[PDB]
Scaffold this active site. Sequence first.
Site, short mmCIF file in Angstrom:
data_model
loop_
_atom_site.label_atom_id
_atom_site.label_comp_id
_atom_site.label_asym_id
_atom_site.label_seq_id
_atom_site.Cartn_x
_atom_site.Cartn_y
_atom_site.Cartn_z
N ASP A 1 4.25 10.90 -10.88
CA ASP A 1 3.71 11.42 -9.60
C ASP A 1 2.26 11.82 -9.72
O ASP A 1 1.84 12.86 -9.25
CB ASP A 1 4.55 12.57 -9.02
CG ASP A 1 4.29 12.79 -7.51
OD1 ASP A 1 3.66 11.94 -6.86
OD2 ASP A 1 4.72 13.83 -6.96
N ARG B 1 -3.03 15.68 -5.38
CA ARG B 1 -2.25 16.90 -5.11
C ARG B 1 -1.63 17.50 -6.37
O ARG B 1 -1.24 18.66 -6.40
CB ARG B 1 -1.15 16.64 -4.05
CG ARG B 1 -0.01 15.79 -4.54
CD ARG B 1 0.91 15.26 -3.42
NE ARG B 1 1.65 14.12 -3.96
CZ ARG B 1 1.32 12.85 -3.75
NH1 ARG B 1 0.33 12.56 -2.92
NH2 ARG B 1 2.02 11.87 -4.33
N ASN B 2 -1.55 16.69 -7.41
CA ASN B 2 -0.80 17.03 -8.64
C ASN B 2 -1.74 17.28 -9.82
O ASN B 2 -1.35 17.45 -10.99
CB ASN B 2 0.29 15.99 -8.94
CG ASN B 2 1.48 16.15 -8.02
OD1 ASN B 2 1.81 17.28 -7.63
ND2 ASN B 2 2.12 15.03 -7.65
N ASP C 1 0.30 21.76 -12.86
CA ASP C 1 1.65 22.33 -13.04
C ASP C 1 2.61 21.40 -12.33
O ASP C 1 2.40 21.03 -11.17
CB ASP C 1 1.69 23.77 -12.45
CG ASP C 1 3.05 24.45 -12.59
OD1 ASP C 1 3.80 24.22 -13.57
OD2 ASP C 1 3.36 25.28 -11.70
C1 LIG Z 1 -5.95 29.68 -6.20
C2 LIG Z 1 -4.97 28.61 -5.98
C3 LIG Z 1 -4.16 27.93 -6.85
N1 LIG Z 1 -4.12 28.16 -8.18
C4 LIG Z 1 -2.97 28.01 -8.94
N2 LIG Z 1 -3.14 28.10 -10.26
C5 LIG Z 1 -2.04 27.95 -11.00
C6 LIG Z 1 -0.82 27.72 -10.42
CL1 LIG Z 1 0.49 27.54 -11.51
C7 LIG Z 1 -0.75 27.66 -9.05
C8 LIG Z 1 0.52 27.43 -8.30
C9 LIG Z 1 1.70 26.94 -8.82
N3 LIG Z 1 2.57 26.86 -7.75
C10 LIG Z 1 1.99 27.28 -6.62
C11 LIG Z 1 2.49 27.37 -5.23
C12 LIG Z 1 1.63 27.84 -4.31
C13 LIG Z 1 0.30 28.22 -4.72
C14 LIG Z 1 -0.13 28.12 -5.99
N4 LIG Z 1 0.75 27.64 -6.93
N5 LIG Z 1 -1.82 27.80 -8.29
C15 LIG Z 1 -3.42 27.00 -6.07
N6 LIG Z 1 -3.76 27.10 -4.78
N7 LIG Z 1 -4.70 28.07 -4.76
C16 LIG Z 1 -5.33 28.49 -3.52
C17 LIG Z 1 -6.38 27.51 -3.07
C18 LIG Z 1 -7.00 28.01 -1.79
N8 LIG Z 1 -5.90 27.97 -0.80
C19 LIG Z 1 -4.89 29.01 -1.10
C20 LIG Z 1 -4.28 28.71 -2.46
#
Ligand SMILES: Cc1c(Nc2ncc(Cl)c(-c3cnc4ccccn34)n2)cnn1C1CCNCC1
Length: 302
Positions: A154, A158-159, A172
């Site tokens: 995948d 997005r990934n 992740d």
């Molecule tokens: C800071 C950030 C991450 N960083 C991040 N880093 C590590 C992980 Cl592991 C994740 C993560 C893993 N699953 C989800 C589910 C929703 C949001 C973030 N994650 N996100 C992912 N999205 N965002 C924001 C970007 C601006 N819009 C709001 C969200």
Amino acid sequence: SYFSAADVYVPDEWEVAREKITMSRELGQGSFGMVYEGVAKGVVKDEPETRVAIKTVEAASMRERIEFLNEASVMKEFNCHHVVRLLGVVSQGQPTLVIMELMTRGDLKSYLRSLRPEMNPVLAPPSLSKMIQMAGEIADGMAYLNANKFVHRDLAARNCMVAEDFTVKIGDFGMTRDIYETDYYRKGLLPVRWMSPESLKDGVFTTYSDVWSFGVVLWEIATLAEQPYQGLSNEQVLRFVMEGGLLDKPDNCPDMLFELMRMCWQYNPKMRPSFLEIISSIKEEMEPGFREVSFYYSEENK
Ligand SMILES: Cc1c(Nc2ncc(Cl)c(-c3cnc4ccccn34)n2)cnn1C1CCNCC1
């Protein structure tokens, strides 16, 4: 008359004391629970403190929290600069926590989308150089995975995720699949617009079809994350692609990048470059420090 089938989570050396963890800003919501940003003590070598991402799950079922722990734990197998790291787990007590490397600029699809001009002065679209740097980080990450006998299946923007310093890493596993849901098609939910012809045919994935997808990610970069085959239905994509159809050179896309796409989108998987080969072709274009952080330039790449 039978084998017993009782899923379990086994605390290991990734276990981290809850007291070492604090949660602040809400990043969003995953399948098992809310995910936050925060701060973890003592989880990076020589780092008293590290900003992190915390994926949480008390109202959830035990079956669910077990499923979440084991799945998340897949990431434990990976230690690469170009793959988002798992830093710890808090399995003891509730709520259940998995501590991940923070990627402040989120997923690459979202990042790319944020570069689109609002409808004010705006930053020019990313350069060849920037795009290539991205391509190489992604490819390094994939090379690592391949070396680790993994097929991603995948690979898409997005990934991938994006760090504060703009470094792109293999994300992740499984975090945008339900978010960017129309990027999938139940024909299992598959990312048909990212899939190789052979995979569209027999539903098998290889490193070679990961390369195909790599091509599509490059196309995403160059279009700021348009939907591939935007004019076509899910069904029409299957046919087009299976029938040797190809994505168009994006407007203003530098020749070189489109050439890259082209090597990836060769019909015969056996003629596509490897991720290693991809990196070799562009290594000179890479920021100096690539040599220090990359799987490619490491002793592990043997
Ligand atoms: C800071 C950030 C991450 N960083 C991040 N880093 C590590 C992980 Cl592991 C994740 C993560 C893993 N699953 C989800 C589910 C929703 C949001 C973030 N994650 N996100 C992912 N999205 N965002 C924001 C970007 C601006 N819009 C709001 C969200």
